[PDB]
């Protein structure tokens, strides 16, 4: 995978450009898709200029005349299988080209050679042809391009008309030509020999190779698209297509004319997100806009709310935000019209892109600074790209445009400052709001009536509502909820309980909201949608809101502001309407809204005020869905807005669900009235009413921000009406007729059941007398509410059964667990065979099955050392595989004790935090695990309360004592599939014995990511469920995220076996595995290994208090104090007997089933049958979309291949073969080599051998040195032990010094390079990610997100970028140069020395937990003197020696940044 | 400049210090305040960064350093330059470098015009006496050879 | 301590054999037979009188304060057969390393090269 571009400044053709383009393309096989076949590819393309002389020569050979005007070439993919389609295709293209009078010059078949591509990629090979046409009317160039684009669109539509699949047009123009295909990158010049002529010369070229996530290729799905290239994936595509279909109705421009009618379906069907972006880009640029203009409009720059930027830039940003919704996410865009060449980033700068300028006026950019081989002394600039930045090359005038130059020149187009004032804000209306007509609240009786009308209990009024309005933040739960799903319960639940939230796995990364607040905005624009091609000031006359959720007074002010343009819709339906009254109500509102929109109305207010004894409230969610989808289908949503007034919104999840449908604003007036009436009753203290209201509003905004950041998107503007959710247990027809597009795996109730439930609740709430709100069972166990997973009888029975050491009591336990009402999906299934049982001693032995169980990870912070060690020893003594969990492990527990017990674990976790990974930590286990997303909290960071981290954990995680240590929600190393493949390669290089496992969470669409991660040399995919516990997580995340593991597992199995990859991995699941029936069902589904988890805790003594997040666990499990730890009661023999009983149960179950071993029932999913719940529920749940499976064939349905899949080794192996004396006698060594950018993670295996021989600190520093010349590879020196010293003469790519644990890396430019060592990048992004100790000395500038998760490293750099030193926990970072934005985000350990020049650092620092000062005490002066002395004597820099020479007065220019939590915990304090 | 790189020899510095002279390094004069007999010297201190990639340190001025020294009689020793030779000898064809010193061939030590040779300190610059004697002997050999040749031809 | 192996890797066998003992030939990965030195062929290496201190005297088991000169011949190779015999002995005392032979360029050295 990768994308790059080569451009020439002057603007003249030359063969050198294409030569260098091919050379660069031929050095990407390391990041590609390495597999076992050896010929299959994944898609590669190049895009260059048309060699007019070549085709002129061709047409001269044919027999015609050589024309003057530039010819036009068009490349087409025609059907090859049936010749009866070639005739029709030629027919269409010719009858639509000759429609204007253009002289067709001829056809041509490009030479090819199909002997080099694979076989699966060849059966889908289309026919490729080229048309050569000319101009006879002497038309200008711009009109030529316009006419060609219109012709292409019309041909595409006409071919769509005949339903002739397998037809495509690569590129049809006179300036550009694209050579793309489904072959391997390197073999390109062998597939298309046309590129080996001595006339194919251009002035610009763009190359790309994509990484196929699935193994079934498709030729038209390979970049570069029509006039665009791309890298990564867009987080929000399903939400942009709807808005595009909305804007379809108000687009027209005299640059097109009548033909505009043939351009309505701007976005086709089946094309990837990059294709849709490409097509809308082409449409927006074919009108007259320039490439940087449409770029700034599509992917805007993040609005930094600081005066540190020019004001015209801020006005342009406001305009570009107002005109079009953004398309955020990972993207390294490389666009080029016939005139400009533009390279750009996204809002956050997620993916890297670096460039360089030669002396010959040639710019070369891509993803690695070593893909091209150029003279090291013939360069003039090695630059990078920050977030939102862009570089431009103007070929028409031959000029380079950097970031600020381009932004200024583009702001010099139109007076953007004079138009941002044409709008109208809201603050001026709320300050001058009429303090009259205040409403009198209802009497308390009617308030309780209306609250009971929504099934709203009273425990929420103190559990999930009181902490929100009290302090200003959400609630937090401390155990995975195992309550039944919404469709199974009989008590009425809120309709929102059927919509689960979406999130993104390793495909697209999450984003932290607690630290990246500068990049997220919640603006709302009323009167916004307009013509997308117009350029005037009527587009910026509108109303702007700072939040979608509003109070009552603000809503009344806004309603009076809207004047006489408001419209109200009845959101209530008659109770005595009949069985189908809901359909009538929905039809009435649907016709009424469509009748009111045409009459002239412009703002539809949908309120539910009409609720009474004879009218029940329609679920506002369904009303919003219906009205929004109708306005979209009827080309009307652009004309109006949609404001909603709910009556049951109290949490942070309901508002997100409502906004995700298409609404704009929400004003829950019952919530405000309840807050007021609970405040006037005096239970909060002496806080004013408006202060509590403000804290409540802020809490809701922060909750919505978190729920938006969980998915990966950044702006609410591109989330409104996106359908980014998951439906479970609703009929397909309803969910597709009243919701835009949501995946529904299994069906469920329709309309009649919902009508029955709503009428039942309305009747039991209104027609009778209620005086007291019931308690309700929804969070913790209460007898009044619904069922639960861990009841008292069950837990006491299990504890007695494991204490008395008896089996019949365990049988009684299992029978009690089984005879319960249907609560989970796996209960509805029933086993069924055609065999007769066998004696119980004919099945496999007890050990033969007990060799398949494991326990999932548990944090060292949320547990006790005693309980952790007990679980570890219990899992080790049986012979199974234990766990270590996030949080490292005590080294002293690595070797056995005198009692004969191994107190070390078996599986190590490398989570988003990397809190304990060292040299030794990664070499004391047999398996690895990448904790991508936890079970209970998907896309969230590992939470841990502040006062629980004692001195022990603070010194074990290299942290500070007593501080809330939250793991980054993203992973900072897994941004796309190639990065995850790189990380797996590193983790397999560091330990040549173990294997690596990945942990995923079940949700729709996991099949693609499964088929992707399987090709990344993994061999175990552990699928977690949504019914798993945690240490501390917000209740909304546990209750409203994730799906049961059954669906995810049954999807992963089918997708892996469909692509013939099933025989290469292992599948293991966990979540709620309690008794043997569930284990055998999981084994039937396709899993092989199993995890238990919380049940094991019950075997230890846990009494299910669900108060672990306060450090007061009564049985002394999740306790960190002294008096409470002594209450421990457990014993490993308990776990022993528990596992033995489970094994015996599954043995007997399989015996009675008939088979003999487990290896024959895995995948035989026809043994399951679906039965009903009873003759009273009348639902239509069909689990059939799971019960199907794919017939494998030759390869089995399990892991037939023992041993891990090895990876190709780099030069470091040869290094080991030379450094024998270092392993046999212990003597110094000095080596040197020539490196390239295709050597991944150099010097890692040497570090492994060193730490295996001696230890973490067994060698004196500088023991062995290795000098590399030229550009190095990726992730240089990963996990180096003390003594190894890697010196480089050149520059590194990225991830340099990752996981350092004692190495000493020195990077410097060559001696023969005339470059300022402080104004050119020499390293990449995320330098020193999660390091632990060691020194690093750079001689250039770093990338973005530099020194993240640093713990004990001492780094010296002459530069930095965005989000430098984020969450720095310890160490030192000397920085000599300007920093980017958002410096030291949430830092709580270490010290930073910044060297400002213009004295502007206070304008960039994120002063949250750190203070900045001048250097005061001479001790710190001496420290900095020592550090810079070592830096200048190690790299022999020029700027370091310059600063050191004029040292007398230059110390006054230094700034010192120190966290606030260590002001009084240092031996030498800060101030005198 | 600095004492380490004074263009002269070090013995002279030590002897001048012994006799009783006072040294002030890294300075440059700018003005001489006075009416008819100079009374003071307004001068500014200077700074020298690290040497470049060639071996020639670059000077700069301090924006806050200004001083005045007592003055009664100022003696300038800024240096020396060669004269304008062409118009001095009514021979405007004398090929001269831009710096004022005249050109001469490397082999025979003969200038552009025949018969006339040129060697010594005027060719090089502010060289030493040993270089003077070297050039003198080389020019003597050149004159002898050329005169023998001219008498022969 | 610093990991410096001051030991050598190729041990010589001159015409004097001033330090050749049993072990001194068991601490190398290569032997050496110094037949004729480069600059002064057909002659024994000298050593002045005032340079031999006590250290070198104990190193060579000689008497301090005297000029050392090795005999020009090797006193063990008087023909090719005795050379083969000495190579056999040297290969048998060190069953790990290889042997070598150092000569000096002149006319007709091809024949003696083929012999060795
Ligand atoms: C108290 C507790 C702490 C946990 N800590 C971690 C953790 O640190 N890292 C992690 O990946 N999962 C952690 N988990 C989740 C487990 O690894 C596993 O996914 C979950 O417990 C499965 O739930 P189950 O026992 O119902 O099957 C924790 C779970 C609990 C209950
Ligand atoms: S179940 Fe958990 S909440 Fe405490 S009592 Fe046991 S650690």
User: Hey, whose CA ends up nearest to atom 20 of ligand 1?
Assistant: A1028
Is residue A1071 in contact with ligand 1, taking CB distance under 6 Å?
yes
Q: How far apart are CA A633 and CA A627, in angstroms?
A: 10
Question: Using an 8 Å Cβ cutoff, are A655 and A644 in contact?
Answer: no
Neighbours of C22 (CB within 10 A): 7
Contact at 8 Å (CB) between A711 and A732?
A: no
| CA proximity to A1089, closest of A881, A1305, A786 | A881
Whether A1135 and A1226 map to the same domain: the answer is no
> Prior bond to A224 cis, omega within 30?
yes
Dihedral sign, Cα of residue A1042, residue A1045, residue A1048, residue A1052: positive
**CA of residue A500 relative to chain centroid, distance:** 17
Whether residue A41 contacts residue A184, with contact meaning beta carbons closer than 8 Å, is answered with yes
- Determine the 3-state secondary structure of A867 from DSSP: helix
A1106 belongs to an annotated ligand binding site: yes
* Chains B and C in direct contact, meaning 3 or more beta-carbon pairs closer than 8 angstroms: no
**Cα gap A972→A516, rounded to integer Å:** 14
3-state helix, strand, coil split of chain B in percent (to 5) is 30, 20, 50
Best A1219, A1222, A1227 residue to mutate vs chain C (most C CBs within 10 Å): A1227
Atom of ligand 1 nearest to the CA of A860: 8
Q: Are the CB atoms for A29 and A394 separated by under 8 Å?
A: no
* A1224 at C interface, C-beta within 8 A: no
User: What is the CA(A1028)–ligand 1 centre distance, in A?
Assistant: 6
Residue A103 in tokens: 């002289």
Residue pair A686/A491 in contact (Cβ under 8 Å)? The answer is no
Distance CA A174, CA A75 (A): 12
Domain at A253, CATH number? 3.60.20.10
Domain shared by A249 and A298, yes or no = yes
Local structure of C58: helix, strand or coil: helix
* CB A889 within 8 Å of CB A916: yes
CA distance A1127 to A1113: 10
Residue nearest to atom 22 of ligand 1 (CA): A1028
Q: Which residues of A touch B53 (CB under 8 A)?
A: 1314
Residue A490's nearest CA partner among A1177, A1029, A1084 is: A1177
Structural element, H or E, at residue C81: helix C80-93
Both tokens assigned to A767: 């027609």
Chain C hits for A1263, Cβ within 8 Å:
3
**What is residue C33's DSSP assignment?**
B
The answer to whether A460 touches A648, Cβ cutoff 8 Å, is no
C-alpha A1406/C-alpha A1428 separation (Å) is: 26
What is the DSSP track for A1133-1160?
Answer: HHHHHHHHHHHHHHHHHHHHHS-S-GGG
For tokens 């360089």, the residue is A356
**Cβ atoms A329, A508 nearer than 8 A:** yes
- As for how many domains chain A has, the answer is 4
Instruction: Based on the fold, state whether residues A1075 and A1171 are members of the same structural domain.
Output: yes
Nearest to A204 by CA among A93, A335, A316: A335
- Ligand 1 centre to CA of A1103 (Å) is 17
The Cα A1364–Cα A1373 span in angstroms is 10
Cα–Cα distance for residue pair A29/A45, rounded to 1 Å: 14
* The pair of three-digit structure tokens given for residue A1206, joined into one six-digit string: 């090895």
Instruction: Give the ligand with the smallest distance to the CA of A479.
Output: 1
What resolution in angstroms does the PDB record give?
A: 4.1
d(C-alpha A560, C-alpha A554), whole Å:
10
Do the Cβ atoms of A46 and A206 come closer than 8 Å? Answer: yes
Q: What is the CATH number of the domain that holds A821?
A: 3.20.20.70
Q: Structure tokens of A885?
A: 């969990």
**Residue to substitute in A882, A914, A935 for testing ligand 1 pocket (most ligand atoms within 8 angstroms of CB):** A935
Q: Inform me whether the C-beta atom of residue A1450 falls under 8 Å from chain B C-beta atoms.
A: no
Q: In 10 A of CB A592, how many CB atoms?
A: 16
Q: How far is CA A713 from CA A724, A1142, C76, in A?
A: 11, 44, 89
- Asked if A418 and A499 sit in the same domain, the reply is no
User: Which one of A1, A170, A925, A1365 is the catalytic residue?
Assistant: A1
Give the C-alpha separation, A1245 to A1278, whole Å: 9
The Cα–Cα gap between A430 and A579 comes to 46
Q: Which residue has the tokens 């997973």?
A: A789
Contacts of A1310 in chain B (CB under 8 A): none
- CB contact at 8 A, A331 and A230: yes
Q: Are residues B47 and A1446, on separate chains, in Cβ contact within 8 Å?
A: yes
Both A435 and A415 in one domain: the answer is no
> Phi, psi (5° rounding) for residue A714?
-120, -35
Q: Are residues A750 and A856 in the same domain?
A: no
Phi, psi of C49 (to 5 degrees): -75, -45
Domain identity same for A1250 and A1348: yes
- Full residue range of the structural domain in which residue A760 is found: 423-780
Q: How far is the centre of ligand 1, averaged over its atoms, from the C-alpha of A466 (Å)?
A: 28
Instruction: Indicate if A89 belongs to the active site.
Output: no
Question: Given the CA of residue A479, which atom of ligand 1 is nearest to it?
Answer: 31
Annotated binding residue A384: no
A-proximal residues of C, 5-34, CB under 8 Å = 5
A956 φ, ψ (degrees, to nearest 5): -85, -30
d(CA A965, CA A1299): 19
DSSP annotation string for A1045-1109: HHHHHHHHHHHHHHTT-GGG-EEEEESS--SHHHHHHHHHHT--EEE-THHHHHHHT------GG
Contacts of A478 (CB under 8 A, 6+ apart): A1030, A1031, A1032, A1033, A1106, A1107, A1108, A1109, A1110
CATH of the domain at A1273: 2.160.20.60
Q: Which residues 650-709 of A are in CB contact (within 8 Å) with C?
A: none
A1053 annotated as ligand-binding: yes
Rounded to an integer, what distance in angstroms lies between the CA atom of residue A482 and that of residue A44? 48
Give the residue ranges of DSSP H helices in A599-688: 620-633, 652-659, 669-679
Asked if residues A765 and A449 have their Cβ atoms less than 8 Å apart, the reply is: yes
CA–CA distances in Å: residue A704 to residues A515, A742, A1445:
15, 20, 54
Cα(A1113) to ligand 2 centroid in Å equals 5
Boundary residue ending a domain (A389, A422, A455): A422
β-bridge partners, A1357: A1375
Obtained via which technique? cryo-EM
Q: Looking at the complex, does the CB of residue A1225 fall below 8 Å from at least one CB of chain C? A: yes
What is the number of the ligand closest to the CA of A480? 1
Residue A1368 · residue A1347 · CB < 8 Å:
yes
Calculate how far, in angstroms, residue A803's C-alpha sits from the geometric centre of ligand 2.
19
CA distances from A1145 to A555, A790, A815, A1078 (A): 62, 21, 12, 11
- Pair of tokens at residue C102: 């150092």
Residue of A nearest to B52 (CA): A1438
Name which residue sits closest to atom 6 of ligand 2, judged by CA.
A1102
Q: Is A412 exposed, middle or buried (0-12, 13-18, 19+ CB in 10 A)?
A: exposed
Same domain, A1256 and A1113: no
Classified as helix, coil or strand, A481 is: coil
**Edge-to-edge strand ranges of the sheet holding A641-645:** A566-570, A603-607, A641-645, A665-666
Note the helical H segments in A892-969: 951-956
Nearest ligand to residue A799 Cα: 2
Ligand 1 atom with the smallest distance to the CA of A1028 is: 23
H/E run at residue A1252: helix A1244-1253
Say whether both A1348 and A1399 belong to one domain. Answer: yes
Q: Of A390, A422, A454, which closes a domain?
A: A422
Burial-class residue A446 by CB neighbours within 10 Å (0-12, 13-18, 19+).
Answer: exposed
Q: Are residues A1287 and A1186 in the same domain?
A: no
Whether ligand 1 lies within 6 angstroms of the CB of A858 is answered as: yes
Q: Which residues of C touch A1228 (CB under 8 A)?
A: 2-4
Answer whether C touches A (≥3 Cβ pairs < 8 Å). yes
Q: What is the dihedral of CA A362, A368, A372, A378, to 10 degrees?
A: 50
Report the alpha-carbon distance of residue A636 to residue A444 in Å, rounded: 42
Q: Are residues A1172 and A1199 in the same domain?
A: yes
- A1062 annotated to a ligand binding site: yes
Q: Which residue has the tokens 């672990």?
A: A1108
Burial A343-354 (b: 16+ CB within 10 A, else e): bbbbbbbbbbbb
CA distance A707 to A503: 9
Contact A1330, A914 (CB under 8 A): yes
- Best residue among A859, A1102, A1110 to mutate for probing ligand 2's pocket (most ligand atoms within 8 Å of CB) is A1102
Report the SS3 class of residue A133. Answer: strand
Query: Which residues 6+ apart lie within 8 Å of A318 measured at CB?
Result: A303, A416, A420, A540
Determine how β-strand A1066-1070 pairs with β-strand A127-133: unpaired
Nearest to A294 by CA among A70, A535, A122: A535
**Ligand 2 pocket residue status of A1216, Cβ below 6 Å:** no
The length of chain B, given as a count of residues: 153
CA distance A539 to A322: 8
Judge whether C3 is closer than 8 Å to chain A, CB to CB: yes
Q: Is A225 helix (H, G, I), strand (E, B) or coil?
A: strand
Residues A801 and A722 in one domain: no
Q: Which two tokens stand for residue A1386?
A: 């949430």
User: Is A1446 near chain B, with CB under 8 Å?
Assistant: yes
H helices of A710-751, in order, are: 732-737
Which of A394, A422, A450 terminates a domain? The answer is A422
Q: Measure B139 CA to nearest chain A CA, in Å.
A: 42
Query: What values do phi and psi take at A36, rounded to 5?
Result: -95, -25
């Amino acid at each position: 995978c990768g994308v790059g571009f080569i451009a020439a400044i002057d603007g003249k053709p030359r063969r050198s450009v294409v030569e260098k383009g091919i050379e660069a393309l031929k050095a990407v096989w390391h990041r590609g898709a390495v597999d076992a076949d050896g010929k299959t590819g994944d898609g590669a393309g190049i895009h260059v200029a048309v060699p007019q002389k070549f085709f002129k020569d061709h047409v001269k050979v044919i027999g015609h005349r050589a024309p003057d005007n530039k010819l036009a070439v068009g490349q087409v993919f025609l059907p090859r299988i049936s010749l009866d389609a070639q005739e029709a295709c030629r027919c269409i293209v010719e009858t639509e080209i000759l429609a204007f009078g253009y002289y067709i010059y001829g056809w041509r078949q490009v030479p090819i050679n199909v002997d080099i591509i694979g076989e699966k990629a060849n059966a889908t090979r289309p026919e490729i042809e080229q048309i050569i046409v000319g101009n006879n009317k002497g038309v200008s160039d711009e009109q030529f391009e316009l006419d060609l684009y219109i012709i292409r669109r019309r041909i595409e539509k006409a071919v769509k008309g005949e339903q002739i699949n397998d037809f495509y047009i690569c590129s049809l123009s006179a300036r550009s030509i694209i050579y793309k295909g489904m072959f391997l990158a390197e073999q390109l010049t062998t597939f298309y020999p046309d590129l080996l002529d001595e006339r194919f010369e251009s002035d610009f070229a763009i190359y790309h190779q994509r990484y196929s996530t699935n193994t079934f290729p498709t030729w038209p799905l390979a970049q570069p698209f029509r006039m665009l290239a791309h890298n990564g994936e867009i987080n929000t595509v399903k939400g942009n297509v709807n808005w595009m279909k909305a804007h379809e109705t108000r687009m027209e421009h005299p640059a097109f004319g009548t033909h505009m009618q043939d351009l309505k379906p701007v976005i086709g069907v089946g094309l990837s997100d990059s294709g849709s972006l490409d097509t809308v880009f082409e449409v927006m640029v074919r009108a007259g806009r320039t490439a940087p203009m449409v770029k700034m409009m599509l992917v805007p720059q993040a609005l930094t709310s600081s005066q540190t930027t020019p004001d015209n830039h801020k006005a342009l940003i406001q305009y570009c935000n107002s005109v079009m919704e953004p398309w955020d996410g990972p993207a390294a865009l490389a666009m080029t019209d016939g005139r400009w060449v533009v390279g750009g980033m996204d809002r956050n700068g997620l993916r890297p892109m670096r460039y360089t300028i030669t002396t010959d006026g040639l710019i070369i950019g891509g993803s690695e600074t070593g893909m091209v081989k150029i003279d090291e002394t013939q360069v003039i600039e090695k630059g990078r790209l920050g977030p939102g930045e862009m570089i431009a090359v103007d070929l028409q005038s031959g000029k380079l445009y950097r970031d600020r130059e381009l932004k200024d020149h583009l702001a010099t187009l139109k007076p953007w400052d004079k138009w941002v004032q044409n709008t109208t804000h809201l603050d001026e209306l709320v300050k001058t709001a009429s303090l009259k007509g205040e409403p009198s609240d209802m009497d308390k009786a009617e308030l309780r009536r209306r609250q009971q009308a929504f099934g709203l209990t009273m425990e929420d009024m103190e559990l999930i509502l009181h902490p929100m309005v009290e302090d200003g933040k959400e609630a937090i739960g401390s155990m995975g909820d195992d309550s039944p799903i919404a469709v199974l319960s009989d008590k009425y639940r809120g309709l929102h309980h059927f919509f689960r939230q979406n999130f993104s796995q390793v495909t697209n990364p999450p984003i932290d909201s607690l630290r990246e607040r500068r990049v997220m905005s919640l603006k709302t624009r009323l009167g916004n949608l307009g013509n997308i091609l117009d350029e005037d000031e009527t587009q910026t006359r509108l109303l702007q809101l700072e939040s979608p959720v509003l109070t009552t007074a603000e809503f009344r002010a806004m309603r009076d502001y809207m004047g006489d343009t408001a419209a109200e819709i009845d959101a209530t339906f008659p109770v005595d309407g009949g069985p189908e009254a809901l359909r009538d109500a929905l039809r009435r509102i649907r016709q009424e809204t469509e009748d009111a929109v045409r009459g002239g109305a412009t703002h539809v207010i949908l309120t539910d005020e009409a609720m009474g004894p004879a009218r029940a409230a329609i679920p506002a969610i369904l009303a919003t869905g219906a009205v929004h989808t109708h306005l979209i289908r009827s080309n009307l949503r652009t004309f109006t807005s949609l404001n909603v007034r709910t009556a049951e919104g109290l949490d942070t999840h309901y508002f997100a669900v409502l906004i995700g449908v298409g609404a704009t604003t929400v004003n829950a007036y019952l919530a405000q009235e309840a807050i007021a009436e609970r405040h006037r009753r005096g239970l909060f203290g002496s806080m004013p009413l408006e202060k509590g209201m403000a804290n409540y509003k802020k809490a809701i905004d922060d909750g919505l921000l978190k729920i938006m950041s969980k998915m990966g998107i950044s702006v609410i503007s591109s989330y409104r009406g996106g359908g980014n959710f998951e439906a479970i247990g609703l009929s397909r027809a309803l969910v597709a007729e009243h919701f835009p597009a949501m995946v529904s795996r299994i069906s469920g109730i329709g309309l009649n059941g919902i009508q029955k439930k709503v009428l039942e609740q309305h009747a039991t709430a209104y027609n009778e007398e209620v005086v007291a709100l019931p308690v309700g069972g929804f969070y913790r166990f209460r007898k009044s509410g619904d069922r639960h997973g861990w009841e008292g009888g069950v837990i006491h029975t299990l504890q007695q059964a494991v204490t008395n050491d008896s089996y019949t009591t365990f049988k009684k336990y299992s029978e009690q667990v089984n005879k319960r009402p249907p609560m989970q999906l796996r209960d509805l299934l029933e086993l069924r065979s055609t065999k007769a049982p066998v004696p119980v001693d004919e099945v496999e032995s007890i050990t033969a099955i007990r060799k398949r169980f494991i326990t999932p990870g548990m944090s060292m912070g949320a547990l006790s050392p005693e309980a952790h060690g007990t679980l570890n020893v219990a899992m080790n003594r049986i012979g199974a595989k234990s766990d270590s969990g996030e949080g490292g492990e005590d080294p002293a527990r690595f070797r056995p004790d005198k009692n004969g017990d191994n107190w070390n674990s078996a599986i190590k976790q490398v989570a988003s935090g990397r809190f304990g990974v060292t040299a030794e930590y990664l070499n004391q286990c047999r398996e690895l695990e990448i904790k991508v997303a936890q079970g209970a909290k998907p896309g969230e960071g590992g939470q841990l309360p502040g006062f629980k981290v004692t001195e022990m954990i603070a010194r074990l995680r290299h942290s500070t004592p007593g501080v809330m240590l939250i793991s980054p929600p993203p992973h900072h190393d897994i941004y796309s599939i190639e990065d995850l493949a790189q990380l797996i390669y590193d983790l397999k290089q560091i330990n040549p014995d173990a294997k690596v496992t990945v942990k995923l969470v079940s949700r729709s669409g996991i099949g693609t990511i499964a088929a992707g991660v399987a090709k990344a040399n993994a061999d175990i995919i552990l699928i977690s469920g949504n019914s798993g516990g945690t240490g501390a997580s917000p209740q909304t995340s546990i209750k409203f995220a994730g799906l049961p593991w059954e669906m995810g597992l049954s999807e992963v199995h089918q997708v892996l076996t469909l692509n013939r990859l099933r025989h290469r991995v292992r599948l293991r699941t966990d979540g709620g595995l309690k008794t043997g029936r569930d284990i055998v069902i999981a084994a039937m589904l396709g899993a092989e290994e199993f995890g238990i988890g919380t049940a094991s805790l019950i075997a230890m003594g846990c009494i299910m208090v669900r108060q672990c997040h306060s450090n007061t666990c009564p049985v002394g499990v999740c306790v960190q104090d002294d008096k409470l730890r002594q209450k421990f009661v457990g014993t490993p023999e308990k776990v022993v007997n528990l596992f033995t009983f489970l094994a015996e149960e599954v043995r007997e179950i399989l015996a009675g089933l008939g088979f003999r071993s487990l290896n024959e029932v895995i995948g035989r999913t026809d043994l399951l049958h679906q039965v009903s719940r009873g003759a009273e529920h009348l639902d239509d749940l069909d689990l059939n979309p799971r019960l199907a499976q794919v017939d494998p064939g030759e390869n089995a349905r399990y892991c037939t291949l023992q041993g891990r899949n090895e990876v190709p080794d780099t030069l470091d192996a040869r290094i080991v073969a030379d450094a024998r004396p270092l392993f046999e006698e212990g003597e110094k060594m000095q080596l040197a080599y020539n490196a390239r950018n295709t050597q991944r993670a150099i010097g890692t295996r040497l570090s492994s051998m060193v730490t295996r021989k001696f230890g973490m600190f067994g060698l004196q520093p500088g023991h062995i040195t290795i000098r590399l010349r030229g550009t190095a590879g990726q992730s240089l020196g990963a996990f180096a032990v003390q003594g190894i010293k890697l010196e480089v003469m050149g520059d590194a790519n990225d991830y340099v010094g990752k996981g350092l644990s004692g190495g000493t890396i020195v990077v410097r430019p060559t001696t023969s390079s005339p470059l300022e060592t402080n104004k050119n990048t020499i390293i990449g992004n995320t330098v020193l990610y999660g390091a632990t100790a060691g020194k690093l000395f750079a001689a250039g500038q770093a990338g973005e997100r530099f020194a993240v998760r640093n713990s004990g490293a001492t780094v010296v750099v002459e530069g930095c970028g965005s989000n430098g030193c984020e969450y720095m926990t310890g160490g030192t970072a000397v920085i000599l140069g300007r920093v980017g934005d958002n410096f030291a985000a949430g830092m709580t350990g270490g010290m930073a020395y910044v060297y400002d020049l213009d004295d502007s650092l206070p304008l960039y620092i994120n002063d949250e937990s750190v203070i900045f000062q001048r250097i005061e005490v001479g001790h710190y002066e001496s420290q900095l003197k020592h550090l810079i002395e070592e830096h200048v004597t190690e790299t022999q820099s020029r700027f370091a020696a310059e600063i050191l020479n004029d040292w007398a007065r230059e110390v006054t220019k230094f700034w010192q940044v120190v966290p606030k939590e260590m002001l009084n915990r240092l031996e030498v304090p800060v101030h005198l | 400049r600095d004492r380490k790189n004074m263009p002269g020899s070090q013995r002279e510095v030590a002897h001048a210090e012994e006799e009783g002279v006072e040294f002030i390094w890294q300075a440059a004069p700018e003005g001489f305040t006075g009416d008819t007999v100079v009374t003071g010297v307004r001068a500014v201190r200077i700074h020298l960064g690290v040497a470049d990639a060639t071996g020639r340190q670059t000077p700069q001025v301090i924006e806050g350093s200004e001083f005045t020294v007592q003055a009664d009689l100022v003696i300038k020793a800024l240096g020396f330059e060669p004269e304008d030779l062409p118009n001095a000898f009514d021979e405007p064809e004398l090929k001269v470098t831009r710096w004022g010193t005249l050109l001469v061939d490397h082999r025979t030590k003969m200038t552009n015009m025949d018969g006339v040779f040129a060697a010594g300190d005027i060719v090089r610059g502010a060289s030493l006496v040993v270089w003077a004697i070297r050039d003198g002997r080389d020019a003597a050999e050149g004159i002898h050879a050329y005169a023998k040749a001219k008498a022969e031809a």
